[PDB]
Amino acid sequence: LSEEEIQRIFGLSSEQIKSLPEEXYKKXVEXTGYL
Amino acid sequence: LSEEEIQRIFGLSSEQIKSLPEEXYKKXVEXTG
Ligand SMILES: [Cl-]
Ligand SMILES: [Mg+2]
Ligand SMILES: [Mg+2]
C-alpha cells in the first residue's frame, strides 16, 4: 500500500499527507462511525 | 469503506480490528517506518 494510494483512498489534502499516520487514524475514526 | 474492508486492505489480524484507529495509525507508519 503506497502513500499515493492512501491519499486517494481517504481523499487526503496536501497538508494532510504530511501527517499520514495521524490523518490514517482520523479517517480510522470516521471507519468506526464516531465522527 | 467498511471496517471489514479496512481489515482486508491493511491485512489486520483478529486482535487488531478491535482498535481500528490505532492499529490505522500503525499500519500509516508502516509507508516506510
Ligand atoms: Cl468486505
Ligand atoms: Mg507524526
Ligand atoms: Mg467493532
Side-chain angles (χ1 to χ4, degrees):
Chain A
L1 183 71
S2 70
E3 291 195 343
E4 190 171 7
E5 283 164 337
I6 292 159
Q7 180 283 314
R8 292 195 302 265
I9 293 165
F10 295 100
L12 302 178
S13 72
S14 51
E15 288 302 294
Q16 288 165 332
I17 66 171
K18 292 180 162 71
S19 304
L20 280 189
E22 300 85 351
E23 294 292 330
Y25 186 109
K26 293 177 187 185
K27 286 275 185 156
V29 178
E30 181 180 27
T32 74
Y34 276 80
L35 299 178
Chain B
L1 298 169
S2 70
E3 294 190 57
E4 173 76 84
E5 283 163 348
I6 294 290
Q7 177 174 26
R8 290 173 177 205
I9 289 163
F10 290 96
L12 302 174
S13 82
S14 67
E15 287 211 312
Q16 284 170 336
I17 61 176
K18 295 182 176 181
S19 186
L20 202 67
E22 292 180 357
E23 294 297 323
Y25 184 102
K26 292 171 44 177
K27 290 295 185 161
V29 174
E30 295 189 351
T32 304

Short mmCIF file of all heavy atoms in Angstrom, two decimals:
data_model
loop_
_atom_site.label_atom_id
_atom_site.label_comp_id
_atom_site.label_asym_id
_atom_site.label_seq_id
_atom_site.Cartn_x
_atom_site.Cartn_y
_atom_site.Cartn_z
N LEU A 1 0.83 -1.20 0.00
CA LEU A 1 0.00 0.00 0.00
C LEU A 1 0.88 1.28 0.00
O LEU A 1 1.71 1.45 0.89
CB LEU A 1 -0.95 -0.21 1.19
CG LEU A 1 -2.01 0.83 1.44
CD1 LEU A 1 -3.08 0.74 0.35
CD2 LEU A 1 -2.62 0.60 2.80
N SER A 2 0.75 2.16 -0.97
CA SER A 2 1.66 3.31 -1.13
C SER A 2 1.05 4.54 -0.46
O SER A 2 -0.17 4.60 -0.26
CB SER A 2 1.96 3.60 -2.57
OG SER A 2 0.80 4.12 -3.19
N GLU A 3 1.90 5.53 -0.21
CA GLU A 3 1.39 6.81 0.24
C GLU A 3 0.38 7.41 -0.75
O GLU A 3 -0.62 8.00 -0.29
CB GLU A 3 2.50 7.82 0.46
CG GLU A 3 3.38 7.48 1.65
CD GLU A 3 4.28 8.65 2.12
OE1 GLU A 3 4.46 9.60 1.32
OE2 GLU A 3 4.75 8.68 3.20
N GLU A 4 0.62 7.31 -2.04
CA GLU A 4 -0.30 7.88 -3.04
C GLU A 4 -1.64 7.16 -3.01
O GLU A 4 -2.69 7.82 -3.13
CB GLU A 4 0.36 7.76 -4.41
CG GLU A 4 -0.29 8.48 -5.55
CD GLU A 4 0.53 8.50 -6.83
OE1 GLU A 4 1.58 7.81 -6.84
OE2 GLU A 4 0.12 9.19 -7.82
N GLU A 5 -1.63 5.85 -2.88
CA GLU A 5 -2.87 5.09 -2.79
C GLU A 5 -3.64 5.54 -1.53
O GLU A 5 -4.86 5.74 -1.60
CB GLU A 5 -2.59 3.58 -2.73
CG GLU A 5 -2.24 2.98 -4.07
CD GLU A 5 -1.60 1.61 -4.03
OE1 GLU A 5 -1.01 1.22 -3.02
OE2 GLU A 5 -1.68 0.90 -5.07
N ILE A 6 -2.98 5.66 -0.39
CA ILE A 6 -3.67 6.15 0.83
C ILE A 6 -4.28 7.55 0.60
O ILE A 6 -5.42 7.77 1.01
CB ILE A 6 -2.73 6.05 2.04
CG1 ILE A 6 -2.46 4.58 2.38
CG2 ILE A 6 -3.30 6.81 3.25
CD1 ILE A 6 -1.20 4.34 3.19
N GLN A 7 -3.51 8.46 0.00
CA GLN A 7 -4.05 9.80 -0.26
C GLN A 7 -5.34 9.70 -1.06
O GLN A 7 -6.32 10.39 -0.71
CB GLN A 7 -3.02 10.64 -1.05
CG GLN A 7 -3.40 12.08 -1.41
CD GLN A 7 -4.36 12.22 -2.59
OE1 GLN A 7 -4.19 11.60 -3.62
NE2 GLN A 7 -5.39 12.98 -2.35
N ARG A 8 -5.35 8.92 -2.11
CA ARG A 8 -6.57 8.83 -2.96
C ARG A 8 -7.71 8.18 -2.21
O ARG A 8 -8.84 8.67 -2.20
CB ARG A 8 -6.32 8.06 -4.25
CG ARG A 8 -5.39 8.74 -5.22
CD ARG A 8 -5.47 8.09 -6.60
NE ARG A 8 -5.17 6.67 -6.59
CZ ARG A 8 -4.01 6.11 -6.83
NH1 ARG A 8 -2.97 6.87 -7.15
NH2 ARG A 8 -3.92 4.83 -6.80
N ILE A 9 -7.41 7.05 -1.56
CA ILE A 9 -8.48 6.29 -0.92
C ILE A 9 -9.20 7.14 0.09
O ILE A 9 -10.42 7.02 0.24
CB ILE A 9 -7.92 4.96 -0.36
CG1 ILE A 9 -7.47 4.02 -1.50
CG2 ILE A 9 -8.95 4.35 0.55
CD1 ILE A 9 -6.61 2.89 -1.05
N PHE A 10 -8.46 7.90 0.92
CA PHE A 10 -9.04 8.67 2.03
C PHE A 10 -9.21 10.14 1.66
O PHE A 10 -9.52 10.90 2.56
CB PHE A 10 -8.16 8.42 3.27
CG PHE A 10 -8.21 6.98 3.74
CD1 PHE A 10 -7.20 6.10 3.41
CD2 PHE A 10 -9.31 6.46 4.38
CE1 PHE A 10 -7.25 4.76 3.80
CE2 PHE A 10 -9.37 5.14 4.76
CZ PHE A 10 -8.37 4.29 4.44
N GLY A 11 -9.04 10.52 0.41
CA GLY A 11 -9.31 11.88 -0.01
C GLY A 11 -8.45 12.91 0.69
O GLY A 11 -8.95 13.98 0.99
N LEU A 12 -7.22 12.57 1.01
CA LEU A 12 -6.40 13.47 1.82
C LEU A 12 -5.90 14.70 1.06
O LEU A 12 -5.49 14.60 -0.09
CB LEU A 12 -5.24 12.72 2.43
CG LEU A 12 -5.56 11.53 3.30
CD1 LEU A 12 -4.27 10.92 3.74
CD2 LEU A 12 -6.45 11.90 4.41
N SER A 13 -5.90 15.83 1.76
CA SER A 13 -5.40 17.09 1.22
C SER A 13 -3.85 17.09 1.21
O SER A 13 -3.19 16.26 1.86
CB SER A 13 -5.89 18.24 2.03
OG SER A 13 -5.21 18.27 3.28
N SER A 14 -3.28 18.07 0.58
CA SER A 14 -1.81 18.23 0.52
C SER A 14 -1.26 18.47 1.89
O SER A 14 -0.16 18.04 2.18
CB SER A 14 -1.46 19.44 -0.38
OG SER A 14 -2.17 20.63 -0.02
N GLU A 15 -1.99 19.11 2.79
CA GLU A 15 -1.48 19.27 4.15
C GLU A 15 -1.64 17.98 4.91
O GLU A 15 -0.76 17.61 5.68
CB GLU A 15 -2.16 20.41 4.89
CG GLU A 15 -1.73 21.77 4.38
CD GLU A 15 -0.21 21.94 4.50
OE1 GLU A 15 0.26 21.96 5.70
OE2 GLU A 15 0.54 21.79 3.54
N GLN A 16 -2.73 17.26 4.72
CA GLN A 16 -2.98 16.05 5.50
C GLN A 16 -1.93 14.99 5.22
O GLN A 16 -1.59 14.19 6.10
CB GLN A 16 -4.40 15.50 5.29
CG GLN A 16 -5.45 16.36 5.96
CD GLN A 16 -6.84 16.08 5.50
OE1 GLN A 16 -7.10 15.63 4.38
NE2 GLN A 16 -7.80 16.32 6.36
N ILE A 17 -1.41 14.90 3.98
CA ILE A 17 -0.45 13.84 3.63
C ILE A 17 0.92 14.07 4.33
O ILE A 17 1.70 13.15 4.36
CB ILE A 17 -0.30 13.67 2.12
CG1 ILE A 17 0.31 14.90 1.47
CG2 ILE A 17 -1.62 13.27 1.44
CD1 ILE A 17 0.69 14.74 0.02
N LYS A 18 1.13 15.22 4.92
CA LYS A 18 2.33 15.45 5.74
C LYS A 18 2.26 14.62 7.01
O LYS A 18 3.30 14.40 7.64
CB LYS A 18 2.48 16.92 6.07
CG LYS A 18 2.81 17.77 4.88
CD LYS A 18 2.95 19.24 5.27
CE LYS A 18 3.68 20.08 4.28
NZ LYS A 18 2.92 20.31 3.03
N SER A 19 1.08 14.25 7.43
CA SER A 19 0.84 13.56 8.72
C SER A 19 0.02 12.30 8.46
O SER A 19 -1.08 12.16 8.95
CB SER A 19 0.18 14.44 9.73
OG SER A 19 0.95 15.62 9.95
N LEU A 20 0.54 11.39 7.63
CA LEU A 20 -0.31 10.29 7.17
C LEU A 20 -0.78 9.40 8.32
O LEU A 20 -1.93 9.00 8.31
CB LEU A 20 0.41 9.40 6.15
CG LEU A 20 0.51 9.79 4.69
CD1 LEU A 20 1.08 8.59 3.94
CD2 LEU A 20 -0.80 10.27 4.09
N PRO A 21 0.07 9.00 9.29
CA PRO A 21 -0.44 8.12 10.36
C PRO A 21 -1.59 8.74 11.13
O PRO A 21 -2.57 8.08 11.45
CB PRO A 21 0.79 7.90 11.24
CG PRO A 21 1.95 8.05 10.27
CD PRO A 21 1.50 9.22 9.43
N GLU A 22 -1.45 10.04 11.43
CA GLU A 22 -2.47 10.72 12.24
C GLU A 22 -3.73 10.94 11.43
O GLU A 22 -4.84 10.82 11.90
CB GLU A 22 -1.94 12.06 12.72
CG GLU A 22 -0.69 11.98 13.60
CD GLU A 22 0.64 11.93 12.90
OE1 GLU A 22 0.72 11.78 11.71
OE2 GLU A 22 1.64 12.01 13.67
N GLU A 23 -3.57 11.41 10.14
CA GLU A 23 -4.79 11.83 9.35
C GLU A 23 -5.46 10.59 8.78
O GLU A 23 -6.73 10.66 8.68
CB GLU A 23 -4.33 12.81 8.27
CG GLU A 23 -3.82 14.09 8.88
CD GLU A 23 -4.85 14.94 9.56
OE1 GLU A 23 -6.01 14.94 9.18
OE2 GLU A 23 -4.49 15.61 10.60
N UNK A 24 -4.73 9.58 8.44
CA UNK A 24 -4.95 7.11 8.86
C UNK A 24 -5.93 7.10 10.06
O UNK A 24 -7.06 6.69 9.99
CB UNK A 24 -5.31 8.32 7.96
N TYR A 25 -5.37 7.51 11.24
CA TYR A 25 -6.19 7.42 12.49
C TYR A 25 -7.53 8.13 12.35
O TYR A 25 -8.55 7.60 12.68
CB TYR A 25 -5.32 8.03 13.62
CG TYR A 25 -5.92 7.89 14.99
CD1 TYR A 25 -5.38 7.01 15.96
CD2 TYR A 25 -6.98 8.64 15.41
CE1 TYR A 25 -5.94 6.91 17.24
CE2 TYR A 25 -7.58 8.56 16.67
CZ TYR A 25 -7.01 7.67 17.59
OH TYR A 25 -7.59 7.55 18.83
N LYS A 26 -7.48 9.41 11.85
CA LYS A 26 -8.74 10.19 11.87
C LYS A 26 -9.73 9.67 10.83
O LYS A 26 -10.88 9.50 11.10
CB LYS A 26 -8.44 11.66 11.62
CG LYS A 26 -7.68 12.31 12.73
CD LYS A 26 -7.33 13.75 12.41
CE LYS A 26 -6.44 14.42 13.41
NZ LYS A 26 -6.25 15.86 13.05
N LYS A 27 -9.25 9.41 9.59
CA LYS A 27 -10.19 8.98 8.51
C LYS A 27 -10.70 7.58 8.73
O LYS A 27 -11.80 7.22 8.35
CB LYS A 27 -9.49 9.03 7.13
CG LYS A 27 -9.31 10.44 6.63
CD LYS A 27 -10.45 11.00 5.95
CE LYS A 27 -10.17 12.35 5.38
NZ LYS A 27 -11.02 12.69 4.26
N UNK A 28 -9.85 6.72 9.40
CA UNK A 28 -9.98 5.04 11.25
C UNK A 28 -11.20 5.42 12.03
O UNK A 28 -12.18 4.69 12.04
CB UNK A 28 -10.20 5.33 9.71
N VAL A 29 -11.15 6.59 12.64
CA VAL A 29 -12.30 7.00 13.43
C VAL A 29 -13.55 7.17 12.57
O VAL A 29 -14.62 6.70 12.91
CB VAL A 29 -11.98 8.30 14.15
CG1 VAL A 29 -13.20 8.73 14.91
CG2 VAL A 29 -10.81 8.16 15.13
N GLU A 30 -13.47 7.95 11.48
CA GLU A 30 -14.67 8.22 10.63
C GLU A 30 -15.15 6.91 9.99
O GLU A 30 -16.38 6.61 10.18
CB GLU A 30 -14.34 9.30 9.63
CG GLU A 30 -15.50 9.67 8.75
CD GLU A 30 -15.24 10.73 7.74
OE1 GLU A 30 -14.11 10.92 7.29
OE2 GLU A 30 -16.19 11.41 7.33
N UNK A 31 -14.32 6.19 9.27
CA UNK A 31 -14.23 3.70 9.60
C UNK A 31 -15.26 3.35 10.63
O UNK A 31 -16.34 2.78 10.35
CB UNK A 31 -14.73 4.89 8.71
N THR A 32 -14.98 3.68 11.89
CA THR A 32 -15.85 3.27 13.02
C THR A 32 -17.15 4.05 13.16
O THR A 32 -18.01 3.57 13.89
CB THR A 32 -15.08 3.42 14.36
OG1 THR A 32 -14.94 4.77 14.75
CG2 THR A 32 -13.78 2.64 14.35
N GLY A 33 -17.30 5.17 12.45
CA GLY A 33 -18.56 5.94 12.51
C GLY A 33 -18.71 6.89 13.66
O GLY A 33 -19.81 7.42 13.87
N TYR A 34 -17.69 7.13 14.48
CA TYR A 34 -17.82 8.03 15.66
C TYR A 34 -17.70 9.52 15.39
O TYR A 34 -18.21 10.37 16.15
CB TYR A 34 -16.89 7.56 16.75
CG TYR A 34 -17.45 6.47 17.58
CD1 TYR A 34 -17.43 5.17 17.12
CD2 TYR A 34 -18.03 6.72 18.83
CE1 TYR A 34 -17.97 4.16 17.89
CE2 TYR A 34 -18.59 5.71 19.56
CZ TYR A 34 -18.52 4.43 19.13
OH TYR A 34 -19.04 3.45 19.93
N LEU A 35 -17.13 9.86 14.28
CA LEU A 35 -17.03 11.25 13.78
C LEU A 35 -17.40 11.19 12.32
O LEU A 35 -17.34 10.04 11.72
CB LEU A 35 -15.60 11.79 13.98
CG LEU A 35 -15.01 11.90 15.38
CD1 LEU A 35 -13.59 12.40 15.32
CD2 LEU A 35 -15.85 12.80 16.22
N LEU B 1 -15.78 3.13 3.06
CA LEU B 1 -15.24 1.80 3.34
C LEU B 1 -15.77 1.27 4.66
O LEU B 1 -15.86 2.02 5.60
CB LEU B 1 -13.71 1.82 3.44
CG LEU B 1 -12.93 2.24 2.19
CD1 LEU B 1 -11.45 2.47 2.48
CD2 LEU B 1 -13.08 1.24 1.06
N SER B 2 -16.09 0.02 4.69
CA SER B 2 -16.48 -0.69 5.93
C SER B 2 -15.27 -1.03 6.77
O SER B 2 -14.16 -1.07 6.27
CB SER B 2 -17.25 -1.93 5.61
OG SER B 2 -16.40 -2.88 5.03
N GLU B 3 -15.54 -1.33 8.02
CA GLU B 3 -14.47 -1.82 8.89
C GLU B 3 -13.87 -3.12 8.33
O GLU B 3 -12.65 -3.29 8.37
CB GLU B 3 -14.95 -1.98 10.33
CG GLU B 3 -15.33 -0.68 11.01
CD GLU B 3 -15.59 -0.77 12.51
OE1 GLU B 3 -14.68 -1.22 13.21
OE2 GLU B 3 -16.60 -0.34 12.94
N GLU B 4 -14.69 -3.98 7.75
CA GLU B 4 -14.15 -5.22 7.17
C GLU B 4 -13.25 -4.90 5.98
O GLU B 4 -12.25 -5.54 5.75
CB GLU B 4 -15.28 -6.14 6.70
CG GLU B 4 -14.84 -7.39 5.92
CD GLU B 4 -14.23 -8.64 6.56
OE1 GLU B 4 -15.04 -9.50 7.02
OE2 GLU B 4 -12.98 -8.82 6.44
N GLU B 5 -13.63 -3.92 5.16
CA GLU B 5 -12.77 -3.56 4.02
C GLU B 5 -11.45 -3.00 4.51
O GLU B 5 -10.43 -3.25 3.91
CB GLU B 5 -13.53 -2.58 3.14
CG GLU B 5 -14.57 -3.33 2.30
CD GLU B 5 -15.68 -2.48 1.69
OE1 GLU B 5 -15.85 -1.27 2.04
OE2 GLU B 5 -16.39 -3.06 0.83
N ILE B 6 -11.49 -2.21 5.58
CA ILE B 6 -10.22 -1.74 6.17
C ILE B 6 -9.37 -2.96 6.62
O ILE B 6 -8.17 -2.94 6.34
CB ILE B 6 -10.46 -0.82 7.38
CG1 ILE B 6 -11.13 0.46 6.90
CG2 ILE B 6 -9.20 -0.56 8.18
CD1 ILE B 6 -10.26 1.40 6.08
N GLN B 7 -9.95 -3.95 7.26
CA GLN B 7 -9.18 -5.13 7.65
C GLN B 7 -8.54 -5.75 6.42
O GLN B 7 -7.37 -6.16 6.48
CB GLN B 7 -10.11 -6.14 8.31
CG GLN B 7 -9.39 -7.43 8.67
CD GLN B 7 -10.21 -8.42 9.45
OE1 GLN B 7 -11.44 -8.47 9.39
NE2 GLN B 7 -9.55 -9.26 10.26
N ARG B 8 -9.29 -5.89 5.33
CA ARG B 8 -8.74 -6.52 4.11
C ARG B 8 -7.64 -5.66 3.52
O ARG B 8 -6.60 -6.20 3.14
CB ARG B 8 -9.84 -6.74 3.10
CG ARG B 8 -10.81 -7.83 3.54
CD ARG B 8 -11.94 -7.81 2.53
NE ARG B 8 -12.86 -8.84 2.82
CZ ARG B 8 -13.66 -9.39 1.90
NH1 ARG B 8 -13.58 -9.04 0.62
NH2 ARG B 8 -14.51 -10.33 2.23
N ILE B 9 -7.88 -4.39 3.35
CA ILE B 9 -6.90 -3.52 2.70
C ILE B 9 -5.58 -3.61 3.45
O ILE B 9 -4.50 -3.73 2.85
CB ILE B 9 -7.44 -2.11 2.60
CG1 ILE B 9 -8.56 -2.04 1.56
CG2 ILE B 9 -6.32 -1.15 2.27
CD1 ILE B 9 -9.38 -0.82 1.72
N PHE B 10 -5.65 -3.50 4.79
CA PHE B 10 -4.44 -3.37 5.64
C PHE B 10 -3.92 -4.69 6.15
O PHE B 10 -2.85 -4.70 6.78
CB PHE B 10 -4.67 -2.39 6.79
CG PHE B 10 -4.77 -0.97 6.31
CD1 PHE B 10 -6.00 -0.39 6.08
CD2 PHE B 10 -3.64 -0.22 6.02
CE1 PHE B 10 -6.10 0.92 5.63
CE2 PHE B 10 -3.76 1.09 5.60
CZ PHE B 10 -4.98 1.67 5.45
N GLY B 11 -4.65 -5.80 5.98
CA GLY B 11 -4.24 -7.12 6.44
C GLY B 11 -4.19 -7.18 7.94
O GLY B 11 -3.23 -7.75 8.51
N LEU B 12 -5.26 -6.76 8.58
CA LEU B 12 -5.31 -6.70 10.04
C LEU B 12 -5.76 -8.01 10.60
O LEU B 12 -6.76 -8.61 10.12
CB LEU B 12 -6.20 -5.59 10.55
CG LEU B 12 -5.93 -4.16 10.15
CD1 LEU B 12 -7.05 -3.25 10.65
CD2 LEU B 12 -4.62 -3.72 10.67
N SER B 13 -4.98 -8.38 11.60
CA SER B 13 -5.20 -9.54 12.45
C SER B 13 -6.50 -9.39 13.23
O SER B 13 -7.04 -8.27 13.36
CB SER B 13 -4.04 -9.76 13.35
OG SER B 13 -4.14 -8.92 14.49
N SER B 14 -6.97 -10.55 13.67
CA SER B 14 -8.09 -10.75 14.61
C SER B 14 -8.06 -9.72 15.74
O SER B 14 -9.05 -9.07 16.03
CB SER B 14 -7.96 -12.14 15.17
OG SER B 14 -6.79 -12.23 15.99
N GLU B 15 -6.92 -9.56 16.40
CA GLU B 15 -6.91 -8.70 17.60
C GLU B 15 -6.98 -7.23 17.16
O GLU B 15 -7.62 -6.39 17.84
CB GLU B 15 -5.64 -9.04 18.34
CG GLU B 15 -5.68 -10.42 19.05
CD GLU B 15 -4.85 -10.51 20.33
OE1 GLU B 15 -3.66 -10.10 20.32
OE2 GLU B 15 -5.37 -11.01 21.34
N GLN B 16 -6.33 -6.93 16.05
CA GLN B 16 -6.05 -5.55 15.64
C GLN B 16 -7.32 -4.81 15.30
O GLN B 16 -7.39 -3.58 15.51
CB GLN B 16 -5.10 -5.61 14.46
CG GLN B 16 -3.70 -5.94 14.91
CD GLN B 16 -2.77 -6.24 13.76
OE1 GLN B 16 -3.23 -6.62 12.69
NE2 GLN B 16 -1.46 -6.20 13.98
N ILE B 17 -8.33 -5.46 14.76
CA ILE B 17 -9.54 -4.77 14.32
C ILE B 17 -10.34 -4.31 15.51
O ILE B 17 -11.22 -3.48 15.33
CB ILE B 17 -10.44 -5.64 13.40
CG1 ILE B 17 -10.94 -6.92 14.09
CG2 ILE B 17 -9.69 -5.97 12.10
CD1 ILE B 17 -11.91 -7.74 13.24
N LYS B 18 -10.06 -4.74 16.71
CA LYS B 18 -10.76 -4.20 17.89
C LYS B 18 -10.30 -2.79 18.26
O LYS B 18 -10.92 -2.13 19.12
CB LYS B 18 -10.53 -5.12 19.06
CG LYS B 18 -11.15 -6.50 18.90
CD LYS B 18 -10.95 -7.43 20.15
CE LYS B 18 -11.67 -8.75 19.95
NZ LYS B 18 -11.47 -9.58 21.14
N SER B 19 -9.24 -2.31 17.64
CA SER B 19 -8.69 -0.96 17.96
C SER B 19 -8.32 -0.21 16.68
O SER B 19 -7.20 0.25 16.55
CB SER B 19 -7.53 -1.22 18.86
OG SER B 19 -7.03 0.00 19.33
N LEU B 20 -9.28 -0.08 15.81
CA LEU B 20 -9.05 0.20 14.41
C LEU B 20 -8.30 1.52 14.19
O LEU B 20 -7.34 1.55 13.40
CB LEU B 20 -10.35 0.17 13.62
CG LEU B 20 -10.20 -0.07 12.13
CD1 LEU B 20 -9.66 -1.48 11.87
CD2 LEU B 20 -11.54 0.08 11.43
N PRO B 21 -8.66 2.65 14.82
CA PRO B 21 -7.91 3.91 14.61
C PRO B 21 -6.42 3.76 14.88
O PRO B 21 -5.53 4.23 14.18
CB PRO B 21 -8.61 4.91 15.47
CG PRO B 21 -10.01 4.37 15.56
CD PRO B 21 -9.83 2.88 15.65
N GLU B 22 -6.15 3.11 16.05
CA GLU B 22 -4.71 2.94 16.47
C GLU B 22 -3.98 1.92 15.55
O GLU B 22 -2.87 2.18 15.16
CB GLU B 22 -4.65 2.42 17.92
CG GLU B 22 -5.15 3.52 18.93
CD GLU B 22 -5.12 3.13 20.39
OE1 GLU B 22 -4.75 1.92 20.65
OE2 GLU B 22 -5.53 3.93 21.25
N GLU B 23 -4.57 0.77 15.31
CA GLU B 23 -3.86 -0.29 14.57
C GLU B 23 -3.69 0.02 13.10
O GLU B 23 -2.70 -0.29 12.47
CB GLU B 23 -4.52 -1.61 14.81
CG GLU B 23 -4.39 -2.07 16.26
CD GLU B 23 -2.95 -2.34 16.74
OE1 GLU B 23 -2.14 -2.86 15.94
OE2 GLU B 23 -2.59 -1.95 17.91
N UNK B 24 -4.74 0.71 12.55
CA UNK B 24 -4.90 2.67 11.06
C UNK B 24 -3.53 3.36 11.16
O UNK B 24 -2.70 3.27 10.29
CB UNK B 24 -4.78 1.17 11.15
N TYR B 25 -3.36 4.04 12.38
CA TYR B 25 -2.10 4.74 12.55
C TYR B 25 -0.88 3.87 12.29
O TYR B 25 0.09 4.25 11.64
CB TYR B 25 -2.06 5.28 13.99
CG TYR B 25 -0.89 6.11 14.35
CD1 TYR B 25 -0.97 7.48 14.42
CD2 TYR B 25 0.29 5.48 14.76
CE1 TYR B 25 0.17 8.21 14.77
CE2 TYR B 25 1.40 6.24 15.08
CZ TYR B 25 1.34 7.60 15.11
OH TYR B 25 2.46 8.37 15.41
N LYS B 26 -0.85 2.69 12.97
CA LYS B 26 0.38 1.84 12.88
C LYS B 26 0.62 1.27 11.50
O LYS B 26 1.76 1.32 11.02
CB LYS B 26 0.33 0.77 13.94
CG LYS B 26 0.44 1.34 15.36
CD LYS B 26 0.18 0.34 16.50
CE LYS B 26 0.80 -0.96 16.36
NZ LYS B 26 0.54 -1.78 17.54
N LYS B 27 -0.40 0.69 10.84
CA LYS B 27 -0.16 0.13 9.51
C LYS B 27 0.05 1.22 8.49
O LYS B 27 0.78 0.94 7.55
CB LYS B 27 -1.36 -0.71 9.05
CG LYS B 27 -1.55 -2.01 9.77
CD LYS B 27 -0.45 -2.99 9.56
CE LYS B 27 -0.80 -4.31 10.23
NZ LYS B 27 0.04 -5.37 9.64
N UNK B 28 -0.57 2.36 8.65
CA UNK B 28 0.17 4.71 8.36
C UNK B 28 1.66 4.63 8.51
O UNK B 28 2.43 4.78 7.52
CB UNK B 28 -0.38 3.45 7.65
N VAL B 29 2.17 4.34 9.69
CA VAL B 29 3.64 4.30 9.92
C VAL B 29 4.35 3.29 9.00
O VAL B 29 5.37 3.62 8.39
CB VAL B 29 3.94 4.06 11.40
CG1 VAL B 29 5.46 3.87 11.60
CG2 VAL B 29 3.44 5.21 12.24
N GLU B 30 3.82 2.09 8.92
CA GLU B 30 4.50 1.03 8.11
C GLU B 30 4.33 1.16 6.60
O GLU B 30 4.99 0.39 5.86
CB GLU B 30 3.90 -0.32 8.41
CG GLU B 30 4.12 -0.78 9.83
CD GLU B 30 3.76 -2.21 10.18
OE1 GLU B 30 3.16 -2.94 9.38
OE2 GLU B 30 4.21 -2.63 11.29
N UNK B 31 3.57 2.08 6.19
CA UNK B 31 4.50 3.51 4.46
C UNK B 31 5.97 3.28 4.55
O UNK B 31 6.47 2.60 3.66
CB UNK B 31 3.63 2.32 4.77
N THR B 32 6.73 3.75 5.56
CA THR B 32 8.13 3.37 5.33
C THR B 32 8.83 3.12 6.67
O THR B 32 9.98 2.62 6.65
CB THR B 32 8.87 4.41 4.49
OG1 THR B 32 8.17 4.60 3.26
CG2 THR B 32 10.30 4.02 4.19
N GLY B 33 8.14 3.42 7.77
CA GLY B 33 8.65 3.14 9.12
C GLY B 33 8.93 4.39 9.91
O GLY B 33 9.37 5.39 9.33
CL CL C 1 -15.78 -6.88 2.80
MG MG C 2 3.72 12.07 13.21
MG MG C 3 -16.20 -3.24 16.16
#
